[PDB]
Amino acid sequence: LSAEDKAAVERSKMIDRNLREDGEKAAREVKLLLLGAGESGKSTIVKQTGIVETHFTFKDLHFKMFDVGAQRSERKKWIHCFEGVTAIIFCVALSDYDLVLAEDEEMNRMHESMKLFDSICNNKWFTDTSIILFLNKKDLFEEKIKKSPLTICYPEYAGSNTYEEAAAYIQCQFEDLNKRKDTKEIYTHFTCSTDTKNVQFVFDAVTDVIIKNNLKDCGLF
Amino acid sequence: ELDQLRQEAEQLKNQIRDARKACADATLSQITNNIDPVGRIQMRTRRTLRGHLAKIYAMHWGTDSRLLVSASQDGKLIIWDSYTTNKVHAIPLRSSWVMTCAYAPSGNYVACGGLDNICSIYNLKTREGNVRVSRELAGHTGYLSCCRFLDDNQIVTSSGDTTCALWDIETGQQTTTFTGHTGDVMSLSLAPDTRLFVSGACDASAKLWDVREGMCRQTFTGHESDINAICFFPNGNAFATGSDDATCRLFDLRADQELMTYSHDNIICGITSVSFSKSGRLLLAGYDDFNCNVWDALKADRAGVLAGHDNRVSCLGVTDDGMAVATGSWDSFLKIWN
Amino acid sequence: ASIAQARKLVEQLKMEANIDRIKVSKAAADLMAYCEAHAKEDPLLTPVPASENPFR
Amino acid sequence: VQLVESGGGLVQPGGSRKLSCSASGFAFSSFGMHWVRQAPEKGLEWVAYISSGSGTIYYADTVKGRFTISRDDPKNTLFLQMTSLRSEDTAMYYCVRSIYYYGSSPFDFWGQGTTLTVSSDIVMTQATSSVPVTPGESVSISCRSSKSLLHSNGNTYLYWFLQRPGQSPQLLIYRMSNLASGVPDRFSGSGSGTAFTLTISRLEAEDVGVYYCMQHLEYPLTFGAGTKLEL
Amino acid sequence: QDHFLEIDKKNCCVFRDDFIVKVLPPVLGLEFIFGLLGNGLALWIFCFHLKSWKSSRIFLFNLAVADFLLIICLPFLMDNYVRRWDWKFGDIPCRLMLFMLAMNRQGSIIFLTVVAVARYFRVVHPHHALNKISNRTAAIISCLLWGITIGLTVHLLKKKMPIQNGGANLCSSFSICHTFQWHEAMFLLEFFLPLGIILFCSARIIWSLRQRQMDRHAKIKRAITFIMVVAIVFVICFLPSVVVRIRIFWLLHTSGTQNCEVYRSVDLAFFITLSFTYMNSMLDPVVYYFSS
Ligand SMILES: O=C(O)c1n[nH]c2c1C[C@H]1C[C@@H]21
């Protein structure tokens, strides 16, 4: 080797050191993929031209959030990029019952939200990821079920026109769409406009998934 | 009326079909029944470069057959030297989501893009010694699937929305826009004479476009599902495409129909990358079952298999001098075979 | 928003209708001739001796 | 792309000195540095080399132990330190930037340098010491090496520098065949092992001075005596 | 009748009973057979069936290697036990057997403790960087632990020739002698302190898994069962020898060393209890390949 070749080798070694340091820094960051029925509750969850990223931190942990609601293309040709995400956040509005035909075709928002959830939580790539499903419209729901019963959908009985069993039925009907009840879990938290404990719930879910992954890695789970 | 126009369109499609049938006499597999087979060919891994720390999406050989560029799942655009394995450059990207790369024939520029929706043009030879963002081309509505260099001032991009664009570098404006597709355009290839180019989309049809005129010349169909990789023959009169049907197809430009189908019963996974060898006797196809197959371009028998990867092959290329073939897969490593 | 797309499709089909075509056998023979005329300069087809192989 | 020097002047034997180089306009952390000395009436000779990241440090055979050179990256400064100052070093010093990778052009930019006054190895031969010339002609200059500089990797290692009157030198031809940046296409170079020729065609003004041929096969760097062109 | 083999200013009793030869060789052979195939299968599976090597795999591989060494080195011991304490291999094999046995025991216990502490740091401190250390740190830690155990047990390798009583031969560092040496602390502390570490780690893991309300999933209850099983096996394997040795020390400092017959009931059983220790080896992979 000549002097120039040796200097090139040293340059490669320095670049390798920098790359390894950057990778080690980036390894200690958990990833959340955010999905919702357009403008349903995502803006509130973010409040506290392609995809948009958020970089909030909480309690000595760095969080990275991707919002991809602005794609409007074939989602099956780019979903595999998100195979390694720590968790998926799903936003569903509880006021979506009635208010039918929001989409151009004649169907309720709730059925299309269910279709999106079934597409995401039974996908081939997401065979080992959990969901932190939020329910966004908690206090419009009370007034809506006061003025109008649950008739436009759910032919089965809703019990009565009180918030308790209505929300219970909605949560039960969403939580059983998945088929692999052992490899993944759903958290089903409710939220309101003035609630200030959402990040704590996300932290608890992320810690649970991290613990499960660590147990599975050491050949004990 | 609309019904009358639709009926006329159907009649015109039938006219195209019968013209294509009339133009055909025999099959390419029939004619090449007296040429000696290539037999068995055995490449081996001469180098292995292991600098990346995530999945590798794109790669492109330089014009000097000595340099490589690779894009990972981070701010990681690495420019390697193949002969001595030392890595020349490391470029940090603003957006970690990338799906395409290209090397200019002048050796001065590199293009990147992906889900970030804009195409970034980087210059390599500058006084300050670093690598700077030369240009940030904007205007697409969907993700970029492939980008190529026409020259140091013309760049052609294919996006998720059913469009293709030919740009200008000094002023970031679309000099020409091609809109003929119904489905996401996934692959783009350029001709040796830099006058025509082929685009492959998600609707199982390959379209041949004129670079200067700005209008389509021919449309080919036949694939069962979406096509992901298209490569030109070195002659410029034929091209082969790969799809998710576990089939590759070789069409000809002048006859305007398909010529060969490469498929076997054992393989059922899709094809992610396709490239040709010099003199056009071999066809290298990267499959989704962690392999990379080599087919004889004149007769459909299968030659040796390049099996050295632990994950799906995502890109593969052949140098301009035909020496070695470089394959990059979803595992961080990429290999060079000779 | 109903007649424009139909008119565009029909005129594109009309433009693609009148493209001159050749026999498949001639194209096949041309491909065979090109393949045979560049055999000696394809390093992958025939093993190049390791004296001048850049990768060693 | 601006390098400045300071600290020179008049010294007495046995003293110590601190020569400073300040850089502005480029990426210091990726560029290695050289210190090269020029006698008041003689040719060039190398002093020291520091690589990127402060990993490899090389001194000349006549400076080792005495001289100590370091650099500070965040402040972008390059220090050289003089101990046991003697009468053989009364000369003017230059700092040179250099980067080493495939296709690089080392010895690209040269600072002005500063003056200091007090009170085996491959030998390069320059054939001539003076050649009168007139505009519109072609000139060939020959430089000879004791041993072949053609390495086994097919790469040759010779760099041509040009020193105009009252101006720091600039790169003309690197690796015996490659034209530098910002230089006209008139210049060319050729030759073979142990024989090198620099050819200038269609001479014009602003082309008088001295020309130097430098080897880069192995340390320490060795230059030539110096060839001049006069009108 | 004296039974009074006295060496090196130590009055020691060495007993030659029939029941030792009656009972030990068969269980030794069974342990030999079971241990070698199982340990090797893990070593083979580890060598040729693992695509990637994480830290935990390396830490278990080290224990597998130690167990393999033990099953390699037992046949000299069983041959010795066959001949009613009649050594024939020589002084070098005697010293080698002693050092191999001590090294196996120390390394097995140390690596069990390391696995337990790693599991604790995974379950109770889920975000600590210790779970993300590179394989280089694993190799360094393994080398350091091997170094400390070798350095601490190297005392026995300057062993005097197999000692002869009559025509019989005795190669054993466990002889009931008046003045203790550094060896006995290596048998008491080695069991006492890892017990504390293991118990602390397992109890904290169970606490932090129950308080977090994670036991609903079946795999977590399986993990809890395995965590309890490991400590149960360790205790039931290494307790009887320690309690017998404590009883020996009790007689030694109470009655004194005058009449060897008093020890007839306790010396014999001691060796039997020591056999229990070897069982731990043949149980080390069986648990850790059953968790999957
Ligand atoms: O296992 C040991 O370390 C050891 N040391 N001495 C003796 C043994 C086993 C029994 C023969 C006698």
Side-chain angles (χ1 to χ4, degrees), chain B residues 20 187 199-207 219-231 239-251 257-263 269-272 274 283 285 287:
Chain B
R20 273 148 166 191
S187 178
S199 72
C202 211
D203 61 356
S205 84
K207 296 222 167 195
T219 305
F220 317 100
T221 37
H223 266 299
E224 194 165 326
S225 160
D226 41 352
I227 70 192
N228 298 349
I230 303 201
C231 205
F239 76 120
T241 77
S243 55
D244 283 28
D245 321 329
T247 65
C248 263
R249 267 154 201 279
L250 180 103
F251 318 96
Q257 61 203 191
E258 99 167 358
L259 276 179
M260 208 97 51
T261 37
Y262 307 127
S263 170
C269 66
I271 319 175
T272 49
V274 161
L283 185 44
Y287 290 77

Side-chain angles (χ1 to χ4, degrees), chain B residues 44-47 49 82 324-326 334-338, chain C residues 55:
Chain B
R44 42 192 61 260
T45 85
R46 303 309 185 148
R47 314 271 181 300
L49 315 106
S82 52
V325 301
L334 62 83
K335 287 199 194 317
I336 292 169
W337 317 70
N338 202 356
Chain C
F55 308 95

Side-chain angles (χ1 to χ4, degrees), chain A residues 40-52 54-63 65-71 73-102 104 106 108-114 116-126:
Chain A
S40 284
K42 305 197 331 294
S43 302
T44 297
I45 309 299
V46 182
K47 259 153 179 47
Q48 92 297 320
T49 308
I51 88 164
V52 53
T54 326
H55 278 102
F56 82 102
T57 80
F58 184 58
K59 284 242 191 163
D60 312 321
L61 252 183
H62 295 323
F63 278 118
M65 211 185 298
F66 316 126
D67 168 343
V68 76
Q71 215 44 246
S73 64
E74 182 47 50
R75 89 164 72 258
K76 62 180 68 180
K77 223 49 164 195
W78 52 261
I79 199 69
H80 56 61
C81 299
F82 305 104
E83 192 162 23
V85 283
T86 312
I88 304 200
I89 298 186
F90 212 102
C91 289
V92 175
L94 270 178
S95 72
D96 286 334
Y97 92 89
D98 82 6
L99 286 204
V100 287
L101 188 147
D104 55 321
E106 66 288 18
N108 188 305
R109 290 209 192 102
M110 192 85 158
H111 280 234
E112 70 96 31
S113 198
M114 290 201 208
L116 208 169
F117 191 84
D118 199 16
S119 153
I120 277 288
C121 183
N122 296 34
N123 220 5
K124 143 162 66 183
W125 305 112
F126 294 102

Side-chain angles (χ1 to χ4, degrees), chain A residues 5 8-9 11-12 15-16 19 22-23 49-51 66 71 73-74 77-78 80-83 125, chain B residues 51 53 57 73 76 78 84 86-90 97 115 117 141-143 184 186 226 228 244 312 330:
Chain A
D5 225 325
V9 163
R11 180 175 183 84
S12 155
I15 297 177
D16 270 327
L19 260 62
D22 184 1
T49 308
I51 88 164
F66 316 126
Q71 215 44 246
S73 64
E74 182 47 50
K77 223 49 164 195
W78 52 261
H80 56 61
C81 299
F82 305 104
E83 192 162 23
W125 305 112
Chain B
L53 267 189
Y57 280 109
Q73 259 294 110
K76 285 326 149 190
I78 285 191
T84 88
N86 63 347
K87 54 163 71 43
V88 194
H89 270 121
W97 316 101
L115 255 46
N117 243 5
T141 51
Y143 70 99
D184 306 351
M186 290 300 297
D226 41 352
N228 298 349
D244 283 28
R312 163 182 65 198
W330 267 21

Side-chain angles (χ1 to χ4, degrees), chain E residues 77 80-81 85 97-98 101-102 105 171-174 183 271 274 278:
Chain E
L77 189 65
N80 174 64
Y81 267 93
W85 318 95
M97 171 255 298
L98 296 181
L101 265 300
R105 267 197 270 104
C171 169
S172 62
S173 65
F174 285 141
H183 187 76
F271 290 126
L274 222 34
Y278 306 142

Side-chain angles (χ1 to χ4, degrees), chain B residues 197-219:
Chain B
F197 73 110
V198 290
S199 72
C202 211
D203 61 356
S205 84
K207 296 222 167 195
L208 167 76
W209 322 72
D210 193 318
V211 174
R212 281 143 212 193
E213 295 302 320
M215 81 205 168
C216 160
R217 291 241 190 279
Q218 273 165 215
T219 305

